Structure formats: structure tokens, C-alpha cells
A paper describes a structure:
Olfactomedin-1 (Olfm1; also known as Noelin or Pancortin) is a highly-expressed secreted brain and retina protein and its four isoforms have different roles in nervous system development and function. The tips of the Olfm1 “V” each consist of two C-terminal β-propeller domains that enclose a calcium binding site.
Based on our previous structure, we designed truncations that are expected to result in a monomeric domain by truncating the dimerizing coiled coil and excluding Cys221 from the construct (the Olfm1Olf construct includes UNIPROT residues 226–478). Our best crystal diffracted to 1.25 Å resolution, representing the highest resolution crystal structure of an Olfactomedin domain to date. Because of the high resolution of our Olfm1Olf diffraction data to 1.25 Å, we can unambiguously assign a Na+ and a Ca2+ ion bound in the central cavity of the β-propeller. Metal ion assignment was based on previous binding data, coordination distances and fit to the electron density. The Ca2+ ion is coordinated by the negatively-charged carboxyl groups of the side chains of Asp356, Asp453 and Glu404, as well as by the backbone carbonyl groups of Ala405 and Leu452 and a single water molecule. The Na+ ion is also coordinated by the carboxylic acid groups of the side chains of both Asp356 and Asp453, as well as by the backbone carbonyl group of Leu357 and a different water molecule than the one coordinating the calcium ion. The high-resolution crystal structure of Olfm1Olf reveals a hydrophilic tunnel filled with water molecules running from the surface of the Olf domain to the metal ion binding sites. In Olfm1, the tunnel starts at the solvent-exposed top face between propeller blade 2 and 3 and runs between these two blades towards the metal ion binding sites. Twelve ordered water molecules are well resolved in this tunnel due to the high resolution of our electron density map, including the two water molecules involved in coordinating the Na+ and Ca2+ ions.
Author numbering: 226 to 477
Write the structure that this text describes.
Amino acid sequence: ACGKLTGISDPVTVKTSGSRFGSWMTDPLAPEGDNRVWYMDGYHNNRFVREYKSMVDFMNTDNFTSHRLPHPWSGTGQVVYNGSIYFNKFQSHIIIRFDLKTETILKTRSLDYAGYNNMYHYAWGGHSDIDLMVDENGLWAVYATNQNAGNIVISKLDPVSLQILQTWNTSYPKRSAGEAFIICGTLYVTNGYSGGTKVHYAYQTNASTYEYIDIPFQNKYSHISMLDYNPKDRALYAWNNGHQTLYNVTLF
Ligand SMILES: *[C@@H]1O[C@H](CO)[C@@H](O)[C@H](O)[C@H]1NC(C)=O
Ligand SMILES: *[C@@H]1O[C@H](CO)[C@@H](O)[C@H](O)[C@H]1NC(C)=O
Ligand SMILES: *[C@@H]1O[C@H](CO)[C@@H](O)[C@H](O)[C@H]1NC(C)=O
Ligand SMILES: *[C@@H]1O[C@H](CO)[C@@H](O)[C@H](O)[C@H]1NC(C)=O
Ligand SMILES: [Ca+2]
Ligand code: NA
């Protein structure tokens, strides 16, 4: 059921909470009936991940468990996959795989040549240099390098070893992307983080081709600091100026 993105539905406000900037997500490999929510407020100087027991508890309570990571993250580009959080260690291009339910670092590895420290942030800033994400095919990193002139680089990653399995060099400047997400092996890039937001560029990893496109999506609360696709519920999770929102998508 994989296909090209053709539409993004109007976003639902799941929660109003937190600072202007952050991330929230569910695990796409969590089993039926498990919709724990993982929540990270801020883009620097925070090592605590909130765990809400379910999407209902997230929407209707302020009850959560607080998980202490071994290091603070940078940015809002974390992802949860098969029970681990993958995140960018502060002030580095290191990725950490941390197994949430055993409080164990399972792997650390540098992401070769990636910029960090607000070098190749998305346009919103916030130390968003390295964005990790999951689609139907597995785990990916979206970043940039000096050898690719600050243009977005995509790598498919091994979720256990953190080694790069394949890399694609796009020609789109990462600092000009508001955010980005991958659906079915295609990178979709937004035009900005404020005002009238749209997906306006797509890079297809299956063919190493790109195009400019125009798929609007509602910036509901004025500023978007996190936007990722989840293949389990086929939705975009966003952090929109202190609100946690969710968009359905339409694929061809
Ligand atoms: C909050 O969650 C904890 C852990 O699941 C639980 O022990 C506690 O009863 C919850 N609080 C309420 C008011 O339900
Ligand atoms: C998820 O982790 C379990 C072990 O906890 C493993 O058996 C399974 O293969 C993993 N799934 C994927 C898709 O990697
Ligand atoms: C990406 O670009 C870098 C810098 O030019 C180059 O070293 C590398 O081989 C490229 N990788 C691919 C898969 O094109
Ligand atoms: C997505 O669509 C389904 C129905 O197909 C609906 O149950 C769900 O609430 C929708 N989610 C959002 C965020 O609109
Ligand atoms: Ca993203
Ligand atoms: Na991410």
C-alpha cells in the first residue's frame, strides 16, 4: 500500500503541553493495543523522556514516567523504534540507541561526516542538524555534510549496529528545509517552519531523483519544530508551538 504522497489532512490537536519546541512519538513496532507516547520537551539541556502509558493517558492526564537518558539530546529529531530511542547526543554527531525498558545503552556510533551544533539545522534552528526517522523500510538519518555543500544527505541505518547501509546526496540545502519526513522511501521536505507551510520537495531514494511539488498542510499554531511520519498509523506527528498534533496523509 506504498505510494506517492498526494494530500495531508487537517491536523488534530492531541495535547497542549510543553515549551515551544519539542518532539513526541509512538513506536511503530509496538504491538496491537500498545500506544505508549514518548515525549521530549526542548531541544537542548534536557535528558528526561516522558513515557505516557497510552494515547488516552497522554490526552487526558498529566501522569507519566520519567526516563533519564545517559546524555542529553540535541534537537527534536529523535525516533522510537522497537523499544529503543535513537537520538543525537548533545554537541556531537553521535547517535545513541537506548533500550527504554531496560535503561541500557545498546549502541553508540558517530554518523560519518554529519554536521552538528546548528551547522545544518533545519530552518527553525534548535540544534536540529540530525533527524532520525522510521518508515515502512526501517531506520533512516537525514542530515547534511560539508562534502555535500550543506545539502541534505539521507542514509539508511542498521538499527542494531548504527552503521550506514546506503547514502543518497540530495541537492536541497538542509538549512532551507523547515523539516522533513520519509514515507515509503521518499524524502519529503517542507518549505519553512512558520506561516503557510507546504511540502515542496521530494527525493525518491528508489531512483535517486527529485522534484518540486506543492502539498499544503495547516500550520495550526504558528511554528513547527518537529514533523515525522509513523508507518504504523500512517500519520505525521508534529510539535507545533507547544501543541502536539497529528495529521493523516493520503498516498496514491
Ligand atoms: C499514574 O501512573 C502510575 C504508573 O502507571 C500509577 O501507579 C498511578 O496509579 C497513576 N495515577 C493515577 C491517578 O491513575
Ligand atoms: C524487534 O526486537 C525483537 C527482540 O526484542 C526482535 O526479535 C525483532 O526481530 C525486532 N524487530 C525488527 C523489525 O527488527
Ligand atoms: C555523496 O557525496 C560525497 C561528497 O561528494 C561523496 O564522497 C559520496 O560518494 C557520495 N555518495 C553517494 C552515494 O553518491
Ligand atoms: C485518521 O483517519 C481515521 C479514519 O480513517 C480516524 O479514525 C483518525 O482519527 C484520523 N486521524 C487524524 C489525526 O485525523
Ligand atoms: Ca522529521
Ligand atoms: Na526524527
